[PDB]
Amino acid sequence: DPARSVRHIAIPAHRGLITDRNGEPLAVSTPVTTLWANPKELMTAKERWPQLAAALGQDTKLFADRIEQNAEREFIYLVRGLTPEQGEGVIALKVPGVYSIEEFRRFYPAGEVVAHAVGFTDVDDRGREGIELAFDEWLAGVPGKRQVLKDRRGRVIKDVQVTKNAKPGKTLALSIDLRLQYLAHRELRNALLENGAKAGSLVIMDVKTGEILAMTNQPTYNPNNRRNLQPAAMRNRAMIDVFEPGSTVKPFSMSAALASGRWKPSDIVDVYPGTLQIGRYTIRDVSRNSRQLDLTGILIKSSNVGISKIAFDIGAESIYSVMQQVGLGQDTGLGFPGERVGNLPNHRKWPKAETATLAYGYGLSVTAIQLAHAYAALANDGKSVPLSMTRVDRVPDGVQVISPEVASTVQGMLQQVVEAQGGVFRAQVPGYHAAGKSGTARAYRSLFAGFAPATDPRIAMVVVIDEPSKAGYFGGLVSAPVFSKVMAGALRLMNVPPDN
Ligand SMILES: *C(=O)[C@](C)(CC(=C)O)NC(=O)OC(C)(C)C
């Protein structure tokens, strides 16, 4: 057993600050006090152990058994993450082999409000979830190195040389606007309990820059106190969970129709008697007191029969292509942990049943992020700007995925869906023209997807509410009023001029 030893040891680096887009702190590394011990030294001072046990709130017997069972080790933790006062209280006992060191611990000042986006670090300040993990290399910095001389008990007797200084991690500014994030968090929360709903997500996106301005989910958790949390509570559902978008994808079906050369908005479809058999299967409308509807009316009344007949005429392939081009069932490139691509199925032959289901948004699966990104492209005159979770100063070129005229026509139809008699009037945003589409999917999921202001769009938004429990479960009743409140608040905070 050696009389001395020499060891190159790590100098930990200070982890980078995560901020919102305006520099509001979301994740900050602050010094906590850690007490550790060298048992080989403790073993020389047993009369001090009970005083030490007491100061640590430990039973004297269990503490003594712990030191005895570790008699051959040079390192154990006593307690991690005290205040300096708490440290100095123990250090005042002057117990041999007991030492304090300051180490960095993440604090999350907004806690539950941004937990799913920001994620968290382990006790070693390593990014283990969300942005903390996705940008770990950026935030972590580079540990330094130094050479210590240790005596026969592994006690540090000299600092010989520093070979490398630590390099701190880098500041990261998210795209999130904490002001919009708090507004969404609170409104989605108020909505959940108003409808006795299980779970929900809300996404707000900048249609010009591709930036995620808000991303909230219920349920949530306090990342500063992760003791006894539900595993459900930690899911970033907006990126992690996939659902059938139902009627919210009808604007893409319609984009394919207006692009085909075969359809204009004042064209007519006969949807009487509100059902359509195709062999074994029957397509069914919620409301079944219509015969002739124009394409705008097909959206206002959300007629499954109407969108299905259009889809038969233009063919599923045209609709599939629009949905693929606006990013449905495609990688976002965000690289967020557990992030889902979902499923936009393909066929060589599209039979009539698959053709109809695709057109009204059954048999495909998307994330809330994806559905928001598609509404952003439609709102941005058919140009998709690539998605960002980080502040965008230099906006990359977007890709024209829907012709500008077709996008402009579908925008106007979606404004009528909100503004017209029989429309989703609860989605109306006071002072503004707004546009979007309600959806309901299967126990129900309640959807609203929209953008505003209609005259020069700035913001796309998706509200998803899981299993509302009141007699009203339609997207137009459950999700639309949340869209209204949050869209109103977000446009005021962003100083967007009233267009109505
Ligand atoms: C759209 O979401 C559709 C396809 C039509 C609509 C009500 O907006 N959803 C639908 O038909 O929902 C149920 C009634 C659950 C089938």
Q: What is the DSSP string of 339-367?
A: ----B----SS--HHHHHHHHTT-S-BB-
Instruction: Calculate the CA 399 to chain-centre distance.
Output: 24
| Burial zone of 137 (CB within 10 Å; 0-12 exposed, 13-18 middle, 19+ buried) | exposed
Interatomic CA distance for residues 364 and 367, integer angstroms: 11
Question: Which tokens in the block code for residue 146?
Answer: 């130094």
In the chain, ranges of CATH 3.40.710.10 domains = 173-500
The DSSP symbol for 23 reads S
Q: Is the C-alpha dihedral spanning 307, 312, 315, 317 positive or negative?
A: positive
Backbone angles phi, psi at 35, to 5 degrees: -100, 125
- How remote is the CA of residue 304 from the centroid of ligand 1, in Å? 8
Nearest-CA neighbor of 125 among 109, 112, 139, 145? 139
Question: Rounded to whole angstroms, what are the CA distances from 392 to 21, 176, 369, 403?
Answer: 9, 11, 17, 25
The Å distance, Cα 444 to ligand 1 centre, comes to 10
Angle at 258 between CA 256 and CA 260, to 5 degrees: 65
Q: In degrees to the nearest 10, what's the CA dihedral of 433, 437, 438, 442?
A: -160
* DSSP assignment letter at 491: H
- Domain 173-500 of CATH type 3.40.1410.10: no
Provide the token pair at 477: 């009743």
Q: State how far the Cα of 230 lies from the Cα of 221, in Å rounded to an integer.
A: 8
The structure's method of determination equals: X-ray
Contact 367, 342 (CB under 8 A): yes
The two structure tokens encoding residue 159:
């600092």
CA distance 497 to 484: 16
* Contact assessment for residue 387 and residue 369, using Cβ atoms and an 8 Å cutoff: yes
Angle in degrees, 0-180, between the axes of helices 250-259 and 368-379, rounded to the nearest 10: 40
Pairing outcome for strands 459-466 and 445-452: antiparallel
* Structure tokens, 457: 């769009």
What is the SS3 assignment for 104?
strand
Q: Give buried/exposed letters for 465-493 (b at 16+ CB in 10 A, else e).
A: bbebeeeebbbbbbbbbbbbbbbbbbbee
The first and second tokens of residue 472, run together, are: 């009203």
- 290: Cα within 13 Å, side-chain hemisphere: 25
Query: What six digits make up the tokens of 25?
Result: 């702190």
| Count of CB atoms situated within 10 Å of the CB of 198 | 16
Residues forming beta bridges with residue 268, ordered by sequence position = 294
Q: Which residues belong to the active site?
A: 247
Please give the helix or strand (H or E) that residue 203 lies within, else none.
Answer: strand 199-206
Pocket test for ligand 1, best of 276, 286, 358 (most atoms within 8 A of CB): 286
Contacts of 66 (CB under 8 A, 6+ apart): 58, 76
446 C-alpha vs ligand 1 centroid, how far in Å?
10
213 in Cβ contact with 176 (< 8 Å): yes
Are residues 253 and 309 in contact, defined by beta-carbon separation less than 8 angstroms?
Answer: no
Tell me how far apart the alpha carbons of residues 380 and 404 are, in angstroms, rounded to a whole number: 9
Indicate if the alpha-carbon torsion angle 262, 265, 266, 268 is positive or negative.
Answer: positive
245 neighbors 216 (Cβ within 8 angstroms): no
What distance in Å separates the CA atoms of residue 371 and residue 373, rounded to the nearest whole number?
Answer: 5
- Cα(479) to centroid of ligand 1, in Å? 14
246 Cα nearest atom in ligand 1: 2
Q: 3-state class of 449 per DSSP?
A: strand
Strands 172-173 and 18-19: parallel
Which tokens is 411 given? 């925008």
Q: Would you call 29 exposed, middle or buried from its count of C-beta atoms within 10 A (0-12, 13-18, 19+)?
A: buried
Scored b (16 or more CB within 10 A) or e, 103-120 reads ebbbebebbbbbbbbbbb
Q: How far apart are CA 409 and CA 411, in angstroms?
A: 5
Q: After which residues is the chain broken (C to N over 2.5 A)?
A: 442
Query: Which ligand 1 atom is at minimum distance from the Cα of 248?
Result: 2
Q: Could you please report the per-residue DSSP string of 25-76?
A: EEEEEEEEEEEEE-HHHHTT-GGGHHHHHHHTT--HHHHHHHHHHTTT-S-E
The pocket around ligand 1, CB under 6 angstroms, is made up of 246-247, 286, 302, 304, 360, 438-442
Question: Regarding beta strands 18-19 and 25-37, do their DSSP bridges make them parallel or antiparallel, or are they unpaired?
Answer: antiparallel
Q: What is the largest CA-CA distance in the chain?
A: 96
Q: Whose CA is nearest to atom 16 of ligand 1?
A: 441
Task: Please state whether the peptide bond connecting residue 223 to the residue before it is cis, i.e. omega within 30 degrees of 0.
Answer: no
Question: What distance in Å separates the CA atoms of residue 432 and residue 497, rounded to the nearest whole number?
Answer: 9
Q: Is 67 helix (H, G, I), strand (E, B) or coil?
A: helix
Q: Ligand 1 atom closest to Cα of 474? A: 7
Show the beta-strand stretches assigned E in 271-328: 275-278, 281-284, 292-294
